[PDB]
Write a protein that binds this ligand. Structure first.
Ligand code: HEC
Ligand code: NA
Length: 78
């Protein structure tokens, strides 16, 4: 099952995508890991696992709230 639950009703996916773009292109492009992300993490319901790993890296600048938003968008839209 997914480690990211369904978005709150009325979730702003457009704003969430902007936050993904800001947070997940700083150290590497999201594009450079996109295929791997989909097969290894999204397909296996482990989106939160990888987002939290990235958050824990030095200089990630990812807050707990950012991680929630980013996980929802990656899980539902990426
Ligand atoms: C602080 C720098 C940094 C930020 C910000 C960052 N990453 Fe990473 N990312 C890394 C490093 C370093 C690696 C290579 C080591 C590894 O695989 O964990 C990596 C690798 C990855 C991988 C490949 C993991 C694998 O199994 O090979 C994925 C997917 C990924 N990042 C997704 C993301 C997403 C999604 C975000 C935004 C939440 C993000 N990254 C933000 C540093 C960062
Ligand atoms: Na680059």
């Amino acid at each position: 099952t997914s480690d990211v639950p369904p978005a709150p009703a009325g979730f702003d996916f457009d704003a969430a995508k902007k936050l993904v773009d800001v947070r997940c292109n700083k150290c590497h492009t999201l594009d450079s890991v996109a295929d791997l992300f989909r097969t290894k993490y999204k397909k296996t319901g482990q989106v939160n696992l990888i987002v939290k790993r990235m958050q824990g890296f030095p200089g990630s600048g990812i807050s707990d709230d950012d991680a929630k938003t980013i996980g929802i968008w990656l899980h539902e839209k990426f």
